């Protein structure tokens, strides 16, 4: 077992070129020293990328557990090396891997501060809601830690994935129910968007803005009335949403719901009062969308209003 030993110290070291050498001669890419460091525990904690890339291309397993359940992702997100994270993933590595308290690398990577680190995780199918042994959340590692940034983040990725127990508590560790993100997107419409209504009525109870828009003025009611569900278009309008908002290209919650087919829907949006008459910026009423898309039932239903 000289040849493991000497290519811990090669990987660790950070000479790649050792790592050639010795790998050519049939050296183990997954030898093992008394704590259980793989080669590519070694080479993702000291941060060099080199060997990394030389390790996942000869076979070295990207789940790689030690003694304490750790595995090379987990040490990628406690040293903050963003290019190690992504490599991991990209060749299949465990997104909500546990520890032995259960840590998954969503916790490591909100508890130091790695906002660029976090965001790779939830792109890639991450649980928010992964809960460890002593009942702390990633939301509760960041609002207490004092990462505020990273819990509207974290908040953000929880209403569009749809974990509705990890949200409440957040709230009452003081998180901003109405944070947007990038392009505007409150919770309110991340929630409604999914089709997930279960916070829909609780980020409603807070107070979030029913009426807020994004960076393109889409209010949440537009994108419930686009995919279908009809249980949250009913609730929006019941707090006084505004019906015949519309965005910069005077799309109106009607507009949307005319072109893909949502009878239910339309005849709500009439329900509370709205005019046929509103166009977008091509001058295209609900009607004249729904006839060349190849849904008739709902240009006549509004016909029959019109």
């Given at each position: 077992?000289?040849?493991?030993?000497?290519?811990?110290?090669?990987?660790?070291?950070?000479?790649?070129?050792?790592?050639?050498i010795?790998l050519?001669?049939?050296a183990?890419?997954?030898?093992?020293?008394?704590?259980?460091?793989?080669?590519?525990?070694?080479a993702?904690?000291?941060?060099?990328?080199?060997?990394?890339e030389?390790?996942?291309?000869?076979?070295?397993?990207?789940?790689?557990?030690?003694e304490?359940?750790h595995?090379?992702?987990?040490?990628?997100a406690?040293?903050?090396?963003?290019?190690?994270?992504?490599?991991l993933?990209?060749?299949?590595?465990?997104?909500?891997?546990?520890?032995?308290?259960?840590?998954?690398?969503?916790?490591?990577?909100?508890?130091?501060?790695?906002?660029?680190?976090?965001?790779?995780?939830?792109?890639?199918?991450?649980?928010?809601?992964?809960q460890?042994?002593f009942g702390?959340?990633?939301?509760?590692?960041?609002?207490?830690?004092?990462?505020?940034?990273?819990?509207?983040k974290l908040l953000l990725?929880?209403?569009?994935?749809g974990?509705?127990?990890?949200?409440?508590?957040?709230?009452?560790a003081?998180?901003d129910?109405?944070?947007?993100?990038?392009?505007?997107?409150?919770?309110?419409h991340?929630?409604?968007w999914?089709?997930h209504?279960?916070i829909?009525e609780?980020?409603?109870?807070?107070?979030?803005?029913?009426?807020?828009?994004?960076?393109?003025?889409?209010?949440?009611?537009?994108?419930?009335?686009?995919?279908?569900?009809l249980?949250?278009?009913?609730?929006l309008l019941?707090?006084?949403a505004?019906?015949?908002?519309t965005?910069?290209?005077?799309?109106?919650?009607?507009?949307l719901?005319?072109?893909?087919?949502?009878?239910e829907?339309?005849?709500?949006?009439?329900?509370?009062?709205?005019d046929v008459?509103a166009?977008?910026?091509?001058?295209?009423?609900?009607?004249?969308?729904?006839?060349?898309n190849?849904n008739?039932?709902?240009?006549?239903?509004l016909?029959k209003?019109?």
């Open positions: 077992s000289d040849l493991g030993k000497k290519l811990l110290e090669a990987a660790r070291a950070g000479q790649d070129d050792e790592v050639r010795l050519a001669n049939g183990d890419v997954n030898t093992a020293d008394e704590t259980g460091f793989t080669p590519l525990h070694l993702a904690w000291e941060g060099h990328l080199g060997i990394v030389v390790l996942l291309k000869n076979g070295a397993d990207v789940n790689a557990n030690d304490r359940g595995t090379p992702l987990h040490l990628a406690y040293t903050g090396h963003l290019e190690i994270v992504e490599v993933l990209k060749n299949g590595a465990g997104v909500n891997a546990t520890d032995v308290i259960g840590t998954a690398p969503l916790h490591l990577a909100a508890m130091w501060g790695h906002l660029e680190i976090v965001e790779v995780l939830l792109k890639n199918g991450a649980d928010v809601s992964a460890d042994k702390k959340t990633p939301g509760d590692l960041a609002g207490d830690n004092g990462n505020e940034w990273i819990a509207k990725a929880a209403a569009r994935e974990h509705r127990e990890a949200v409440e508590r957040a709230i009452k003081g998180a129910v109405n944070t947007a993100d990038e392009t505007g997107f409150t919770p309110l991340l929630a409604a999914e089709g209504l279960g829909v609780v980020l409603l109870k807070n107070g979030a803005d029913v009426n807020a828009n994004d960076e393109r003025g889409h209010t949440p009611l537009h994108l419930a009335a686009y995919t279908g569900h249980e949250i278009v009913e609730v019941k707090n006084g505004g019906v015949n908002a965005d910069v290209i005077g799309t109106a919650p009607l507009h719901a005319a072109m893909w087919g949502h009878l829907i339309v005849e709500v949006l009439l329900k509370h009062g709205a008459n166009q977008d910026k091509f001058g295209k009423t609900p009607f004249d969308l729904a006839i060349d190849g008739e039932d709902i240009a006549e239903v016909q209003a019109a």
